[PDB]
Every structure is written in C-alpha cells, then in structure tokens.
Ligand binder design. Structure first.
Ligand SMILES: [Mg+2]
Ligand SMILES: [Mg+2]
Length: 300
C-alpha cells in the first residue's frame, strides 16, 4: 500500500421535519451548501452540491479530514441560480461558525417573477472523525412558507380578487448562525399569484367563486419583538377588512388538532398554509369562523 487508513466523516442529509414526519430531501433539496468548522468554531472548508446525485436517497458526502471533532452546517436552496437568499458576512468580522448570516435578496419582495421564494433549508451537526469515515446525519428544516388566503362569500355570491390588496408584514428576512431571526426592519410581502377559484356549487346550481392570493414568506416564529400581520384591504375605499396577528391565528389550528406539539415546531414543520375568510354581501369579514388548512376554527 501507500498511505495510512483514510480518515474523516460521511454525511447523510435528511429533511423529515415536516407534517408527514418523512424524508423529502431527495425531492425538495436541489442544491446543498455544506460548511466545515473546527471544535473552536473556525472556518475549515465549504462543499457545494448542485447535481442529480441529491435526488439519490443513498447519497452521502465523503469528507477527508484531519483527526478531530467538527461542526457542520448545511444549507439547502442557497447554491443554485434559483436561490432567493444570500450568505452575508460582516466586513471586518470573521468567517467562523458564529459570524454567518443569511438574508433574503430584497429583489424577491418586488420582482413579480421572483416573489415565489425558492425553498430555504437548514441543519447542523457536531461529529468526530473516524478511520474509514464516521457516519452522521444532518437533519434539516424548511425556513420558507406558502400562505394561500381565500375570500369566500357566506351566501355563495362571487368575490372579485381585483377588488383587494393582500399583504403580510413581518421582520423575518435576516437569519443568525443558529437559524434564529435577527431584527432587521419590517418587510411587506405581496402575492406571487392572485385570482379567482371554484368552491363548488350551491343547491340552486350556482357556482361559488372565491378570491385567492398566494404569498411566499421567510420563517414564521413566535418571538416577543415582532408580531407578523396578515392584511386584506379593499382597493376602492382603502378599508382593511382583515388585519390579524397571523401567527396567533395559525396557532388556533395547532391548539385544536396538535395541542401537544410545540408552537415553533408546528410553524416549522408546516410550510403549506391555507386560510379561508368568509365575507358578508357588503364584503366585510364575518369574524366568527375561518378555515385553516381545511379545518374550521372558531376565532373568539
Ligand atoms: Mg436550488
Ligand atoms: Mg413553516
């Protein structure tokens, strides 16, 4: 032979932090950024994977490393050209584990062709190396969300989407190294898709036509420094018919169906949201019952 035994790690990347409690990494993460830090948190290396090998569930990242204990950080949706977020380093400050920040590219808030955000995934792992590579799994979570807002008349008469403006105000486009949100100033999300949809027919054979808006946002978190808002405004008179604390309303679904689940876990595991608001003939919101993810929730 020539050399001593190969040494390092062999990493598996999974995304099972969803409501199905099942790995969807192969079908959801198309680009991977893997960062290597030493035991003290100092930068060592970066590995970027954008190929078809990510669709293989048997995929492992073999890393030849000097004997030691390492901390690995994985990002999904940062590497390919479709990406909505950027790695951010503070000029003058280091490149270590605790110096990394990820921010949304501000052009995604306004460019209609970029409003529907590319999935952002994150996970980390501390793992010591071994002869013939130690095995470790980087368990990842999804940071982006899709919220479909529906306006439906209680009597079944149509709702014209063009009569309304839909917004989500939040302060959630800057992430620290530990994937927590950093206060960076309020942003306004507007719909990437808006129109009308069918909700079936009335007993009089009349089609029920609803208004919808799809909004794509960054991480939904319970925190004491920001209360994200969902706002629905009538264009003609500027009246805000809906103005609610979005996170509180979603957690009314958790309290009903997933009472033992952690609030943050629920906000992270679920990434596909839908909310139906019922309107009176004057197009005012009937503040009694709504639908969250097809489940009827009492507000008061
Ligand atoms: Mg990608
Ligand atoms: Mg989520």
């Amino acid at each position: 032979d020539l050399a001593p035994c190969p040494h390092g790690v062999s990493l598996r990347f999974i995304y099972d932090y969803n409501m199905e409690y099942a790995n969807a990494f192969a079908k959801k993460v198309d680009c991977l950024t893997l960062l290597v830090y030493d035991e003290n948190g100092n930068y060592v290396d970066t590995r970027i994977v954008t190929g078809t090998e990510l669709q293989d569930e048997n995929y492992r990242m073999k890393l030849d490393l000097k004997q030691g204990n390492y901390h690995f950080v994985a990002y999904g949706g940062l590497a390919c050209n479709k990406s909505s977020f950027l790695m951010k380093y503070t000029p003058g400050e280091g490149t270590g584990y605790t110096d990394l920040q990820v921010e949304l590219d501000s052009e995604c808030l306004t460019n209609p062709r970029r409003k529907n955000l590319h999935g952002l995934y994150w996970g980390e792992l501390t793992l010591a190396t071994a002869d013939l590579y130690s095995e470790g799994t980087v368990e990842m979570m999804k940071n982006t969300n899709n919220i479909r807002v529906v306006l439906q008349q209680m009597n079944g008469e149509p709702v014209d989407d063009k009569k309304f403006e839909f917004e989500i105000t939040d302060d959630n486009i800057l992430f620290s190294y530990d994937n927590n949100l950093l206060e960076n100033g309020m942003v306004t999300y507007t719909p990437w898709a808006q129109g009308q949809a069918s909700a079936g027919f009335t007993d009089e054979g009349r089609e029920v036509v609803v208004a919808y808006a799809e909004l794509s946002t960054s991480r939904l978190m319970v925190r004491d420094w920001y209360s994200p808002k969902l706002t629905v405004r009538r264009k003609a008179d500027g009246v805000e018919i809906i103005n609610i604390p979005l996170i509180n309303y979603l957690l009314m679904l958790k309290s009903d169906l997933y009472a033992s689940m952690d609030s943050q876990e629920f906000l992270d595991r679920e990434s596909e949201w839908s909310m139906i608001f019922f309107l009176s003939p004057n197009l005012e919101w009937i503040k009694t019952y709504i639908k969250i993810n097809d489940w009827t929730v009492r507000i008061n």
